[PDB]
């Protein structure tokens with residue numbers, strides 16, 4: 001099974017200048033819980049944005065060019081990325097925009113955080129046909145002293 005996980009600001013913005021400008025510790029905690037002990041697939045730009053391997057996960061980087069770091073696994077195509085994950089129940093695709101576009105047709109589940117914040121950005125989550133997806137979990141949180149915007153965690157499953 002392939003799942004995507006992402007955090008979206010208003011208008012589906014996911015990034016600006018190869019960075020995420022907000023800070024939401026509760027969402028990073030949700031990301032860690034839902035990805036730990038699973039393989040994670042990311043594009044090369046997102047690998048550079050993160051800047052170091054994510055512990056407790058098999059890190060698979062999609063890039064057309066040779067890899068430059070043996071702490072992670074480098075693959076050159078979508079099919080190779082999937083094969084490199086082996087026979088696991090759930091593969092987590094962690095972006096960015098171009099990578100989400102390629103894996104969305106193959107995905108059965110979306111883990112989305114909707115952040116109530118307006119962000120100038122240059123990268124967006126793909127348009128996804130709402131009729132194809134059923135909401136199976138949602139949980140709203142107001143802003144607090146640690147998390148400066150309200151946010152909604154949602155899990156969607158393909159119908």
Ligand SMILES: NC(=O)c1ccc[n+]([C@@H]2O[C@H](COP(=O)([O-])OP(=O)(O)OC[C@H]3O[C@@H](n4cnc5c(N)ncnc54)[C@H](OP(=O)(O)O)[C@@H]3O)[C@@H](O)[C@H]2O)c1
Pocket residue numbers: 005006007008013014015016017018019020042043044045046047049062063064065075076077078094095096097098099100102123
């Ligand atoms: N809010 C969120 O949830 C979230 C999550 C992830 C990322 N982001 C943000 O998203 C932005 C990065 O997204 P992005 O669209 O610019 O880049 P991306 O999807 O991270 O990376 C694209 C790169 O991945 C490689 N690639 C992708 N598909 C490939 C394929 N089929 N075969 C071989 N290589 C492939 C290429 O690398 P080469 O040029 O090396 O071939 C391509 O240039 C940043 O702002 C980041 O902070 C946000």
Ligand SMILES: Nc1nc(=O)c2nc(CNc3ccc(C(=O)N[C@@H](CCC(=O)O)C(=O)O)cc3)cnc2[nH]1
Pocket residue numbers: 005006007020027028029030031032046049050054055094095112113
């Ligand atoms: N829901 C969600 N939120 C995000 O912010 C997010 N970000 C990315 C891409 N960017 C990043 C940047 C940093 C880390 C990271 O360092 N994660 C640590 C969390 C510990 C911490 O710094 O709080 C990890 O161990 O997973 C992960 C993804 C991909 N999917 C996402 N998905």
Ligand SMILES: [Mn+2]
Pocket residue numbers: 077079
């Ligand atoms: Mn091929």
Ligand SMILES: [Mn+2]
Pocket residue numbers: 086087
């Ligand atoms: Mn197999």
Ligand SMILES: [Mn+2]
Pocket residue numbers: 116117118148149150
């Ligand atoms: Mn806000």
